[PDB]
Amino acid sequence: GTSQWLRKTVDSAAVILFSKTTCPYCKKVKDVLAEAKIKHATIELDQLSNGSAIQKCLASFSKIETVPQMFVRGKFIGDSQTVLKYYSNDELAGIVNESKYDYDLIVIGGGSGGLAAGKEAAKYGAKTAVLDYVEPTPIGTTWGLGGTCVNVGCIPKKLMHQAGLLSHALEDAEHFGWSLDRSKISHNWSTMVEGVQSHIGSLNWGYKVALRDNQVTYLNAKGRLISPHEVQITDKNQKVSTITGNKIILATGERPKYPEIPGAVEYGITSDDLFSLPYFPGKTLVIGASYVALECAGFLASLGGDVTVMVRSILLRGFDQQMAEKVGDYMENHGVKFAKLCVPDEIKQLKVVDTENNKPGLLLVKGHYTDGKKFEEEFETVIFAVGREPQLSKVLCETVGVKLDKNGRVVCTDDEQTTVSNVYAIGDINAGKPQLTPVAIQAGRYLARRLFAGATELTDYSNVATTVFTPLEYGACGLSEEDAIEKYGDKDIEVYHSNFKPLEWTVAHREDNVCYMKLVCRKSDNMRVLGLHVLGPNAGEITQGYAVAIKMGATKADFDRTIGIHPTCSETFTTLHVTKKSGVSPIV
Amino acid sequence: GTSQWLRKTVDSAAVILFSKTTCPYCKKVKDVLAEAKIKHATIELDQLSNGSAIQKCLASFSKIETVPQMFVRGKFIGDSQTVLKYYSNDELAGIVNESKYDYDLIVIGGGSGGLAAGKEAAKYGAKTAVLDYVEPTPIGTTWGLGGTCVNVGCIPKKLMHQAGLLSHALEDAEHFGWSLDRSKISHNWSTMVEGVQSHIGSLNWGYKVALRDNQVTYLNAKGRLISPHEVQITDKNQKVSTITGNKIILATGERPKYPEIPGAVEYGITSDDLFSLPYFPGKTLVIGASYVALECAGFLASLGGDVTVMVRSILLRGFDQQMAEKVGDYMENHGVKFAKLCVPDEIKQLKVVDTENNKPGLLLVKGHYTDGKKFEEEFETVIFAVGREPQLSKVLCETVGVKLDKNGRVVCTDDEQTTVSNVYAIGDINAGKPQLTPVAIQAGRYLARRLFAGATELTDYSNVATTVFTPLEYGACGLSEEDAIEKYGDKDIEVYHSNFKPLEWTVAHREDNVCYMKLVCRKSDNMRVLGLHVLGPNAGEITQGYAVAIKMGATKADFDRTIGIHPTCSETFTTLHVTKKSGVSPIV
């Protein structure tokens, strides 16, 4: 029925006021709470489908059925008159604060997900604390509040991606009539890092202010869940203590892996160090083949660097592989070299990194190909991008009872709840969910609404669009081609595709048939669009809008009746017609 | 019902074949028709929702009920045996060219819609001619086949727009670490015009080649409808003749208007001349407030030009005015000077345009503001953008019977048919249709299928998306805000909005709170999105995809449940919460 909704809501909420929009008694109580600097959620019963039933079940707690009723942490406080009797007796503050625990919510991890959840939580009166600590890299790198996206992920790579795109702007400017000469222009890595770190510092500080100004307690300490309500924190001065919270949210992210080979941890770096490195990396070897490894080799080339990528097997494993190879074939034609079907054996240090004069060392990389041929080349820097993983042993005592899948990730129900009942996990460590910063923000905000404001909304994790920020960007939404065929069979899958050329690339004398797009649709379902794929500039801005249509179950008919915006790259989606089965060429 | 469709198809198609995929006799006929280079439409009866009735209704024409059946211009030709007997006896070619008119279709106008139409009809066996003539401008500017967009519209304008954006890229490159100094680079106008014209020329040639390869007769002559089936053509030599056609499509577009003031036609120019001008315009007065006027003033300013814009009343009349005002504020903050509430009286000539040294003339402009105060200033170039109009006088003889609305645009039923039963109109001259290149193309293609292949699909003109390619671009889809309030009332309209700042603008030190987007919704229709509006970079790429979701009736919840792609500008549409009635600020 409706009853157990109301028991969960009243039991979980901190300060909550069942109210009416038109009732003047309720309105005077609200303004009392505002003047009292008392935050709370407000369930206005007159704008819900069955508010009349909810007033009936309110009597199951309060022996009354009128409005307003105020509750604090499961307890019925009183009706109108009762609460202002507390106010002009000055007993209100004592009763709204009193609680079995120190906090209504402890969040372990101050990243995209945790900070999102704590800021939405304190909005509804939940007494909240948020914990964040950055264990240093093996060479000692460190950064402030915000998470992986803010300090060592989406933010600084797209800015470094942007510095690389700008090199083609300088090339293109001549053909559009600008007097400059691209041949006479070099890049300065340190000036870039300083501007990138300046914007990161603004984000760091701005998060501390958001927490300060929302009544969230920020603790720069490493917390560890020892029991289902108990968190054991460690100071900057290694000082250890214990706080307690009613509800706990785990959101501590992942960190870079290294291969188990000698020299790796000692002499190489990872993405965590690349964004604040104080010297240009020089001649660089990137080991791996995920979006991290391509994106970084991507801009490192565009800034004049001598870049090699060492690929064990395939590029972008798990993405559509036609597009993967189109991505990779572009980078190879524009500077990035690849050593295909090759794997590393050890790293020898020939020269130490020169802190004083600000210059890299010199390394020797020993490898072998699959056939058995041997690799051996000198490199000034070696970056490892061979995956990321959580380390929940540092965060979670075995004995508390939280179930971990075979990767170390947290098994949650579809509302983010662990096996222990009052503990939840969001973000990269939620098992089998897409590891993206906008996902972690939605899970975090939609969970806080459910805990402290009686919400029902769940996070939808399906058909979440992505974009890979390689020199030519690749945005995608939905299934890949190979996956659609495997799920429904080659006969039932029809693919529309077509090359294109940006107008902007005409005067600039760029390639005619590298930019490509395709719609993978299902025949026996009115040609429903299953996945969408585009390789070209601004692929992120192109793809986004269609993510809404695809959540709404778009079909090829819907794309055909929508008119294009001319001249854009994106309008090519509105008039696709060549089918893969037909065999007709997709060139311009 | 089925009855009158079949009769309409058989009477207008040129060569049509009624068939089934499974049949081997029709496969036999297809193979013979393909061999003889005979182009035809082909219904596949075993693929239609009611082929049992379409088959049975065919007997009204062939006195037979089987398949295949081939018709030519309303006449039943024969079954399988009867067709091969014509083939094997050398009679089949003459039957399929037997026609009452010179052409199955004559298209008056070789621009966006007309080129699209003739090429589609040719592809179904229709014998087609397209006519195209470029009436020279007052100073005699003239160009090649393609239309207004190709030669003097979207294509050269976005290329000059792009030259303008690249000046901000040369600026921003400094702050991402590149050595260059923006302050010592200049722009060469003629080099850019050379590159742009070069690409226009390759479109001119491609369109000639495409009409050749579809066997479309291309007459570079001026056409004129003298009777429902008689078109009068006039040579480059003035050689007048007459051709006949079964179906006629009007697609003659528009041309720029001039104000009725002394010196306008003698000493000013329009956009028709600007895109191939041999000298730089210099100090320039732009008279108007349309998207033509602002887009041109925009890039002209970004190229180093001293630019002024003379506004009668408001900017972008017809578009959401809050957006328009923000568009104008940005230009005024980045160069362009505005003479507000001002109108011109006369243009005087102080200096004649110098062909020899390739420099502009010099003019004196006199006007007055709306309060009698005087305007007087010198400019080297004066560009009129005071609207456009057709001149159907020059193409449509009064006595044919084609009816015009009070603007001079053709009045059409929602299938593009005029008051005369066999004459149709597409593109700009179609009354009350949005005047855009993609609209013309879709109208022209969908019509040609209905006429020569039994199609039924109409063109949808509602909710067509637009982008104004000013220095900050502005893209939109659906109603303006004032329009939505006007139709439903303030109480029923809710507006969600937010500023934003592209990530690319952080390191480059650009403005914090200039970029803006909003969604206008209907409270009583489930918060249906009635209009989308965004101001910022790549606004065309941003908007296009969202047009599809609006076309399927997207609501606010649909935008909420879709996850953003990060870091993009476009992702801000997925987390909008501040409302206008709320009174909260939309800054960041």
Ligand SMILES: Cc1cc2nc3c(=O)[nH]c(=O)nc-3n(C[C@H](O)[C@H](O)[C@H](O)COP(=O)(O)OP(=O)(O)OC[C@H]3O[C@@H](n4cnc5c(N)ncnc54)[C@H](O)[C@@H]3O)c2cc1C
């Ligand atoms: C190089 C790179 C580029 C990326 N680019 C993109 C991109 O373009 N778009 C995108 O959507 N995603 C991108 N991602 C992924 C994105 O960063 C993650 O999806 C997101 O950061 C996950 O957020 P989270 O809140 O789950 O974890 P995090 O953001 O990693 O937050 C976890 C935080 O908790 C801290 N912590 C850990 N253990 C403890 C502890 N015991 N006590 C206290 N605090 C602790 C961590 O130090 C960190 O501060 C990128 C990732 C990388 C590595």
Ligand SMILES: Cc1cc2nc3c(=O)[nH]c(=O)nc-3n(C[C@H](O)[C@H](O)[C@H](O)COP(=O)(O)OP(=O)(O)OC[C@H]3O[C@@H](n4cnc5c(N)ncnc54)[C@H](O)[C@@H]3O)c2cc1C
């Ligand atoms: C500066 C500018 C910028 C624009 N930018 C955009 C944009 O970014 N996006 C967009 O969607 N739209 C844009 N437009 C509008 C776009 O150009 C039109 O919507 C489009 O050209 C409509 O095509 P049409 O076939 O109706 O007319 P047209 O393309 O003008 O075709 C008409 C053709 O018929 C010829 N003709 C005329 N009379 C005769 C005759 N008697 N005999 C033979 N031929 C004849 C004309 O010379 C012309 O070649 C822009 C317009 C301008 C002026």
Ligand SMILES: Cc1ccc(CNC[C@@H](C)O)s1
């Ligand atoms: C013609 C114009 C209408 C609006 C313009 C720019 N806004 C100026 C305002 C802030 O005074 S220019």
